[PDB]
Structure formats: C-alpha cells, structure tokens
Design a protein around this ligand. Sequence first.
Ligand SMILES: C[C@H]1CN(S(C)(=O)=O)CC[C@H]1N
Length: 460
Amino acid sequence: QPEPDMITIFIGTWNMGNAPPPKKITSWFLSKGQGKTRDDSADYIPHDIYVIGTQEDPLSEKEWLEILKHSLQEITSVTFKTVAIHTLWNIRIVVLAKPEHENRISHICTDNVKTGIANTLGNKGAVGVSFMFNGTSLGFVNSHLTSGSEKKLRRNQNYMNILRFLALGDKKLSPFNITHRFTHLFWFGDLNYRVDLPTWEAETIIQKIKQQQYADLLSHDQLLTERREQKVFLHFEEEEITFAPTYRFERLTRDKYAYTKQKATGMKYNLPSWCDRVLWKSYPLVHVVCQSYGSTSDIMTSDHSPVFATFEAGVTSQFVSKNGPGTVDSQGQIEFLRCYATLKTKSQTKFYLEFHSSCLESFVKSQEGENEEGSEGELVVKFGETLPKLKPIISDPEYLLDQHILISIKSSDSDESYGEGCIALRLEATETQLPIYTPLTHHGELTGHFQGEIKLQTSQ
Ligand SMILES: C[C@H]1CN(S(C)(=O)=O)CC[C@H]1N
C-alpha cells in the first residue's frame, strides 16, 4: 500500500445558534448549496480528513460525534475514526479521518484560548487541533470572535491573542507561533466580520443578495478590507466568496434575513454578513488547492448557514535512509550567501539568526550579524557569507527539496525573536546560488524581511 502525496481535507464551520441540528446535514459534508460546490460525481468519495468547527453548539461531544459519524457513514459507508475533539464553552472542533490513516496520524495536540478581559471574558475564543500526517504537519483553528459591526478592531485583537497563545504543534519551535508551525494551517469559524454599509441600506443589501450581486457587498466586507490594509490575517488566503451572506437568517427558512435591532440583539442591527469563513496558510511552494467554498441552503435550525471548504493538500512520507534519521548525511548541505535582514525595529541591539527544521537534528544558532543604517531609516542586519552551513539528516533530493527552513532573528541582549519567516527548499536547481526571500513577522505583524541567496547540495 503506497503512501499518499496528496490528501483532501474538508473544513466545516457552523454557528448552530444554540439549537439542535436537523435530522439530515449531509449537504454540508457534500459541499452542496451556494458558492463553489463539489461535483455530484464525487459524492461517494470520502475526504481523507474532516475538520468540523462549531460555535453556539448546544450538544454534548457525545451527541455531536454520533451525528457526525452517522452522517459520514450514510454518505460514504466509511466508519471514520475520531482523531481529536476539543470544546471551549460552546466552541468545538472535531477531527475525523479515514480508518486507513489511523497509523499515519501522530503527535495530536489540542488547545484553546479565551479572548477578552472581565466584561469580555466568558464566551468568545478559539479551539484548535494539530497533528502529523506522515511527514506533514497540519493545524486547525476554530474561532468565535467578538460580535457586532462596530467591533472589527476587537476581532483583530482576538485574532492576535489566539495566534500568540494557542499552543499547538512542535513545542521545540519556541520562537514560532501557530502561523509558522505547520505545513498547512486552516483557520475558520464565526469570525464575525460584517458588511459595513449604512443601516438605512438594509433593504438595498437584501435586494442585491436576491440578484446574486455580491460585488458591491464584498467591497465593504470588514474581513476583506481589514486584510487589504494588513490589519489581520496577514499571509493567509481565502477563496473568492460566491455564496450569499450566511448571517443573520430567520430560523426554519432561508427566505428572510433578520437584520432589525431587537432587545435580544442589544439594540444592534445585524446587516447580512459573511460572518462564517475559512482561511488557510501553507508553507511556500506546497500544493494547496481550494476545491469548494460555499454554504448549505437546506440546514435552517440556526440563524447562520453552515459553510464548507475543501482542499487538496500536498503531503510527504516519513522518510528513512541508511543514514538519517539518527545521524547526518555528509552528502547534504544548505549554504547561505549575501544574506541580510531588514527590520522595522527602532531599537539598536545585536541580532543573531536561528534556523529550525525537521530536516536538522536540532536548531542552529548563527553568529551576530553586522548592523548598518538603511537609506530610508531601516535597521539592516548583514550576515554576508557568515551564516553556518546546515547539515540535513537526509541528502536524498526526493526528501530534501520538500523541506522548509524556519528563520527567527533574535536580539543578543534578550534572546526574544524580532521576526519569524520561512524558506522553501523546493529550488529550481541544486549546487546553484539562487535568490531566497521571506517576510518576517512577530505576533503575526510584519516586522521586516530576510533575503539573500541559497546553495543546496543533495545526493544528486
Ligand atoms: C494577499 C492576498 C489577499 N489580498 S487582500 C483581500 O487585499 O488582503 C489581495 C492579494 C492577495 N495576494
């Protein structure tokens, strides 16, 4: 039985509105309804992994697990294995996988983050799951962010708290937050970003939705506009939205948006909005293709419609050679030429680099770089030709070209990371000087750049 080089992953997000689901929810898992939907000819083909995010979930874990497994069994005739389930208040994540994957999946981690302080601590936050699938690290975040049209800044703050404090993936990757720890990171939930149009335009918005004319609505979607101004979800992707706003519906129909202010809403309008979203971030030059992104039309127990997204994701095998793992392979090396970091920091301390990768036996610390002034104020940290020669555990190009090097630039004074980025070894050539580049971030915000040249030697 050969190891896969591709798997398909189903991501679902549903705010259930504290109501039990209807007896049939198979349309969700089949990516049927509005938007980018899945071909009928694929209906019996199981996804490799199903990741289900719920918000305002009134069910026990046991109750929801039985509905999800019986749903997938009716679709596929496959009895899925429970990889992980984690609940914070009414925010839940379930990960199910095909039984054939049980011994491909390891290093399962779960965590949660509670967002806000006092007033604002008690029901919003995030749950997450990570694991290895063969040689590929996968992370999944289900977040329920702050509600209300006038709280997009709060949502952006909730995002930064979640990516700073959610403890998933390889704890040895100590300078790196969840936005650098995974081959593929999927972040989804009731993110609660709204279509920011005047309240007096509610009926105009509804008109536009009935005409399936989303263009003038999406131009005011707070997640797209905040992303465009680099306020949130920097270096994440989202598929184009071609489905109607998923909030706020009258229950038991999809014929009516319930937008008017009510005691029950705290006297807030809920203009139709794309609250319910799926985004991802994969390492540079790894295959990831969105194959569906849409909403169901036939699940109406909640004031939200379920959202589905499906992805092709590149995966690698658990590589064994005669040499590594458990030693180096003298035939492999990674060299760096003409390298420099450009940092936004106003501070003047010395900096060194750390290189982290599962292709190394352990992380490597460089010598301090030489600080110079950029022509536009910037701090430029020059490494020239001084960076170490990295010794990968396996030299086979079929392994080494699929790997990545995480970089942290750390202060010599404090040993705190000022920026994190990632470099793909999927080079156009080996034994050849090639440009490399990554942006650097810290707490998910842009803090600088790293650029230079790489020279990769493999056993070929
Ligand atoms: C960075 C993405 C998404 N953005 S966006 C919606 O402005 O943030 C446009 C260009 C794309 N490469």
